Amino acid sequence: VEKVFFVTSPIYYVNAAPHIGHVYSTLITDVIGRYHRVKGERVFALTGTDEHGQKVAEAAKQKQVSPYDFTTAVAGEFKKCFEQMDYSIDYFIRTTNEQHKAVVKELWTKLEQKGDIYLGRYEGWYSISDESFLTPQNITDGVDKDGNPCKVSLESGHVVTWVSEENYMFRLSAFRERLLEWYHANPGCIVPEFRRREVIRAVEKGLPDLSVSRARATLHNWAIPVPGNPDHCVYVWLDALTNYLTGSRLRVDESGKEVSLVDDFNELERFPADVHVIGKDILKFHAIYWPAFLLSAGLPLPKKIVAHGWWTKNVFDPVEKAEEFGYDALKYFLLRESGFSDDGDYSDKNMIARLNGELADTLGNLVMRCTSAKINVNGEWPSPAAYTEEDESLIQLIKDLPGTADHYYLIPDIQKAIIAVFDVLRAINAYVTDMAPWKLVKTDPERLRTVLYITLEGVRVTTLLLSPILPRKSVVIFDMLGVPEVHRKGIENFEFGAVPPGTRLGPAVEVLFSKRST
Numbered sequence: 367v368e369k370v371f372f373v374t375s376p377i378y379y380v381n382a383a384p385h386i387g388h389v390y391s392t393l394i395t396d397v398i399g400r401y402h403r404v405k406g407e408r409v410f411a412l413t414g415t416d417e418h419g420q421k422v423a424e425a426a427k428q429k430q431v432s433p434y435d436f437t438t439a440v441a442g443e444f445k446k447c448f449e450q451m452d453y454s455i456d457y458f459i460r461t462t463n464e465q466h467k468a469v470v471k472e473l474w475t476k477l478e479q480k481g482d483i484y485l486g487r488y489e490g491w492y493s494i495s496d497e498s499f500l501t502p503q504n505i506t507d508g509v510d511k512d513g514n515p516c517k518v519s520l521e522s523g524h525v526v527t528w529v530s531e532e533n534y535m536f537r538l539s540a541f542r543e544r545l546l547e548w549y550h551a552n553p554g555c556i557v558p559e560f561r562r563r564e565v566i567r568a569v570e571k572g573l574p575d576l577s578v579s580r581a582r583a584t585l586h587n588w589a590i591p592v593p594g595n596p597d598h599c600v601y602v603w604l605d606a607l608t609n610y611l612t613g614s615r616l617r618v619d620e621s622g623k624e625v626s627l628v629d630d631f632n633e634l635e636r637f638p639a640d641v642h643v644i645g646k647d648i649l650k651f652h653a654i655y656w657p658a659f660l661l662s663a664g665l666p667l668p669k670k671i672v673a674h675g676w677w678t679k680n681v682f683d684p685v686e687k688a689e690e691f692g693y694d695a696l697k698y699f700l701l702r703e704s705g706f707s708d709d710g711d712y713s714d715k716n717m718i719a720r721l722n723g724e725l726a727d728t729l730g731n732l733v734m735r736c737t738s739a740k741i742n743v744n745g746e747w748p749s750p751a752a753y754t755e756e757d758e759s760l761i762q763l764i765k766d767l768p769g770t771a772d773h774y775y776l777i778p779d780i781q782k783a784i785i786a787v788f789d790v791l792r793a794i795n796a797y798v799t800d801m802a803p804w805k806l807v808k809t810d811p812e813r814l815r816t817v818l819y820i821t822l823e824g825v826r827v828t829t830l831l832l833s834p835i836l837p838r839k840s841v842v843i844f845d846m847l848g849v850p851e852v853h854r855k856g857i858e859n860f861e862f863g864a865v866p867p868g869t870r871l872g873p874a875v876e877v878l879f880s881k882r883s884t
């Protein structure tokens with residue numbers, strides 16, 4: 367069933383300036399988006415800011431400025447940061463947007479009409495930093511920035527507070543079975559698997575109803591009013607989760623401004639999300655509440671939620687490190703160094719190690735070998751002669767690479783997709799070392815034709831599959847190889863031999879990735 371591939375990042379709270387956490391989440395969103403564009407699919411990637419709520423209002427009162435001003439300013443910083451990082455996100459959404467508020471009111475009303483929202487009370491703990499209702503088993507003793515004995519969350523370690531309010535409640539308990547049916551029927555719907563097992567055991571243990579409104583005094587009136595009850599506001603999370611639905615209904619122009627809000631989501635072919643990218647800290651909201659809301663309203667459910675191991679909500683400034691080591695290099699490192707854990711070190715030591723060892727020595731050196739005037743004397747893709755069994759063993763790897771990488775990208779597991787490409791790059795280097803084409807120019811020109819061609823095609827296919835990870839460097843690489851534009855995109859060009867012999871190399875000026883001191 368052909369649709370627009372819809373991939374999202376979380377929308378980030380604007381209480382604080384952007385940092386690595388948001389960058390990483392949005393990078394993963396971007397890379398997925400980019401891969402599906404390379405595949406030749408229609409894409410809509412979405413990122414944004416979560417601007418309402420008690421936490422943002424209190425962050426604004428701290429800086430002593432009006433919530434409206436504060437949110438607009440920080441949202442501007444988020445846009446500036448994502449432009450600087452050179453992402454390719456299709457739209458940046460803000461929950462302050464009037465069209466978003468409209469959607470939230472439609473959704474609220476639907477849920478209320480379906481009989482799934484009732485007037486009740488919430489009496490219990492709450493973390494204002496996490497905007498999360500917690501049960502007594504999720505709290506314990508700690509300290510506030512005062513150094514005073516207070517209660518704190520087990521999840522996050524943020525300070526908790528008792529809440530006792532008459533609140534609109536969502537009948538989440540009613541969706542326990544349907545959610546379990548969903549998890550079991552679609553065993554890939556939550557990645558990675560151990561996070562899937564967590565959600566299941568949680569929902570198995572039973573679900574309480576969820577407070578979806580709060581007394582307007584509590585939130586300092588910085589939130590969306592409940593339809594037909596201006597004393598209550600919509601829970602920042604029902605507000606925030608609904609962005610995905612809103613994004614799927616916005617027509618967007620050349621510039622990137624929202625220009626229209628279609629009534630029916632089907633009109634734009636985006637909903638539901640194919641991949642929701644999130645951090646592990648917000649799994650419950652995306653894997654439990656969000657699908658229950660959609661079930662209540664009769665909306666389609668997302669296909670995949672992927673939860674990585676950072677926290678969405680000693681310094682590491684990504685814009686700064688990118689200026690030092692290069693943008694693509696940094697992205698690669700972040701994507702390669704870490705899978706589904708915090709573990710893996712992000713030090714300058716290991717950062718330089720990967721730059722020099724993989725990007726420069728493995729990829730960079732290989733690109734210079736197959737384009738060198740010394741080795742490639744004609745500056746063109748040569749026509750291969752007969753293939754040895756060794757030739758054919760490398761070709762087999764190059765041919766198998768796209769299918770393997772495709773699966774990894776789709777899981778999605780971007781680390782394993784990188785590892786798989788680089789395994790082929792390591793192979794090509796070994797092959798080149800064995801064949802020693804520098805010697806062959808003098809000894810056996812017919813043999814060189816064959817070696818060089820395989821090497822070039824290996825470099826091209828690896829580079830194509832790495833183009834979502836190294837979007838600027840892939841282009842430079844292709845420019846060196848003289849690969850025509852049409853051959854830089856599309857599944858047709860995952861195939862071995864897509865670029866014909868006689869294709870001329872691009873001119874020289876020039877090192878691809880420069881190495882650095884330890």
Ligand code: MET
Pocket residue numbers: 375376377378379416606607608609648678679
């Ligand atoms: C619907 S995504 C909401 C995520 C939350 N605002 C955060 O910053 O972590």
